[PDB]
Structures are given as structure tokens and as C-alpha cells.
Design a protein around this ligand. Structure first.
Ligand SMILES: Cc1ncc(CO)c(N)n1
Lengths: 210, 228
């Protein structure tokens, strides 16, 4: 019954991609949908899909009613452009933007400018956030500041994922500051009508079982 | 804990009607871990095909290489191959690795009627992939294209089944338009969408079921999915 769309790259050998997204969707009880922006070989080569087709792929997905959208690797600035308008063209939906760098600056400036305001939640991490802010994150106070300054870009929330001394994942929300395929799992709960904090908590708890 | 693994080598139908997306769903529905290689990304609307972008042949092989290095594939499916260079790359890629159950669905035309296989590529499909298939699943139009003769009666279906067997495939499943024929070197059996059935066959083969049963199971799966 729940429907969720992933708009990302394709890695045939497992790992990040529509393949990894769609497995978590049906694993969490969500009817997964997919739109391919690029094709990857696990990295021997990368092939970008033309932006007009990337947009044309999305239109075909909405008749169906999508309950949540996941956004992985958008390799071109023009793909991000076409993606953004495509999501804007249709009705408001919980949108999860996973900013995957690997990184052309031409392209990243379109994530923040064209796509982050659309997001209901972005899930970056330590090195990836540094790309978005140009500043190195060396402290949790800096990590806390980065969650704030990121949230300022438009996303109703920000899950900053910190690997490292010891570090904790931080959820930047309006109420306050509280391998990863979490984005696919977070969007899955959102399709199920869960609110943002329980979607994040149930998603993280879902991964820790493995 | 490693369960059966299957691989689809088809195109992308972002709308989810056909292509690898429908293959993956029948793979997981039948309890098989699904791998996927994209040969081209297509956008299909109710009106027709809004666009096709062929993935480079050099790439498709790399995707296949990525799949078999990671895991052991228990059965393989070829769906849409759009250009002849893909067909050769896919053929050499499957040849490069061990002898598997290979289901070759010769898709040539999308639901709307627009082409999904360049005419120059179908004969490379016959020379390169058909000798590698353990079963090919053509319907009556696709056979009429593979052979040039029209199939208008059940008698002609059995000849087409025999003619197709000569191309290399161990078995041929000819789909009527009102009986289906499973043709083997040992004989013919006549039974009383296409992407789903092909993937379902490969899925049961991926679970180690013998070829005639895998077909009867696949048809039962398809019958269940359509009616209810
Ligand atoms: C990739 C693909 N395979 C099959 C069909 C339908 O035959 C389709 N429309 N697209």
C-alpha cells in the first residue's frame, strides 16, 4: 500500500543505488519505485543519463500516488535542475535528500540552491557536510554548528552523521538538535505516515540489527 | 546466510510496468535475492515511449562483471537489449563466466507498440545469445520476426518451435494468441506479462527447480498475479 520513489544512481554490485534503495523499501513493507540518473560499475566507469530523460522518468512514476521520495546520486547540475522541477511540479511529499558526493562544485551548488529547500530531511555525514559548507568539521560544537548552518539551507531537518574523538549522529530539527542506506529506510517510514523523529529512530534501530 | 541469487539484464521502465523493476519484484516475491544490470533507461507513459537512452556496451559488461565478482548468480535473465553492440557485450559477458540457467526473453516491442530492439540487433540476438539460453520465451509476433514466417495455426507454432530450437536454445517456450508450447530436443508439451513470466521462470531455476516445473510454477505465479 505505501509507495516510495528513489531517484538515484545504479550500482549493480550492491551498495548505494536504486538496487539498495528498493530492497529496503520492500523489506520495510513499501512498494518501491525507481528513476535512474546514472549507471555505475563497482568504480570502473560512470555514465550520466540525459537530464530531460531523468525528468521524463519521474513523470511516468506519478500516474500512482507516491508517499515518499528518496534522492541519492544526482551526478549533473542539470540533473539536479531537472529533478528539482520534477518534484516541484507535483504535490508536496516527504522528500529525503541523501547528498552523495562520491563532486563537481557546479553540481553541489544546485543541491543546496535547487533541491535542499524542497527536502523534508537531508541525511549528510562528516566529509560530505564539509563539501556543502566548505569548512572542515573537527569538533562536535562545529558538528552542532554544521547541523544548524545546514538546516538554514531549507531542509525541515538535517541528520548529520558523524564517524569521528568519539562522535554521535545529530538530528537538527526546529525543536532542537538531538556504509549508510538510512535514507532509503527513513523515506520508507515516511511513506508509512510516521512523523520525522520516529521515522529516524525506527530507521536507525532497523539497521543496528544487522 | 546466502539464499538463491538471480540476475536480470534488461532495461529500465521507471514507471514500473516492465523492465528490471518488474523483474526484481517477481524475484523478491518468489524468495530470490535479485541482482540487476541496466542496458538502457527508458521513459514510458500511457501514450507511449517518451525516450530511450542506450547504455554503452563497454559499461553493461562492467555491470555484469561487478555482479559475478560480488556473488554467485544461480540464474540469469535477459530482457531488453536495445542495440546489437549490447547483445554482443552481454553474450561475451555471459560466455566469460560459468554455464548458468539463462532465460532469454526476446523483447522487441513495448506495451505501446514502439520498438525496444533495433531490427539490426535481432539477428545478433540469434547468433550470440540464443545458443547460450537454456530457454527462450518468444510470443507469436516475436517468433514471426525471428523466423520471417507467419505463425497462424497451432501446426505452424510447432514448426516455429522446432525452427527456433535449431538456433541453439535448449528449450523454447512459444506463447500463443490459444495454447503455449514448450519445445525441447526430446519433444513438445502444449500448455493451455512476458517480463513477469520470464523473470518467474528464471527465479524458480535460480531456486534449483527443473526446467519443466519452473515453467509450470512460473505460469501459476503469473496466473495468480493477473487474476488476483
Ligand atoms: C525494459 C522493458 N522491457 C519490457 C517492456 C515491455 O515489453 C518494456 N516496456 N520495457
Amino acid at each position: 500500500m505505501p509507495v516510495a520513489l528513489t531517484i538515484a544512481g545504479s550500482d549493480s554490485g550492491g551498495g548505494a543505488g536504486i538496487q539498495a534503495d528498493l530492497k529496503t523499501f520492500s523489506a520495510l513493507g513499501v512498494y518501491g519505485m525507481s528513476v535512474i540518473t546514472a549507471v555505475t560499475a563497482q568504480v570502473q566507469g560512470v555514465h550520466d543519463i540525459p537530464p530531460e530523460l531523468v525528468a521524463a522518468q519521474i513523470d511516468a512514476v506519478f500516474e500512482l500516488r507516491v508517499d515518499a521520495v528518496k534522492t541519492g546520486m544526482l551526478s549533473n547540475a542539470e540533473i539536479v535542475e531537472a529533478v528539482a522541477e520534477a518534484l516541484r511540479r507535483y504535490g508536496v511529499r516527504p522528500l529525503v535528500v541523501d547528498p552523495v558526493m562520491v563532486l563537481a562544485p557546479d553540481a553541489v551548488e544546485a543541491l543546496k540552491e535547487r533541491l535542499f529547500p524542497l527536502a523534508t530531511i537531508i541525511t549528510p555525514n562528516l566529509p560530505e557536510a564539509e563539501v556543502l559548507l566548505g569548512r572542515p568539521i573537527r569538533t562536535e560544537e562545529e558538528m552542532e554548528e554544521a547541523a544548524r548552518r545546514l538546516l538554514a539551507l531549507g531542509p525541515k531537518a538535517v541528520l548529520l552523521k558523524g564517524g569521528h574523538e568519539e562522535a554521535v549522529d545529530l538530528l537538527a530539527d526546529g525543536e532542537g538538535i538531538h556504509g549508510c542506506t538510512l535514507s532509503a529506510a527513513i523515506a520508507a517510514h515516511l511513506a508509512r505516515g510516521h512523523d520525522l523523529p520516529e521515522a529516524v529512530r525506527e530507521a536507525k534501530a532497523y539497521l543496528t540489527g544487522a
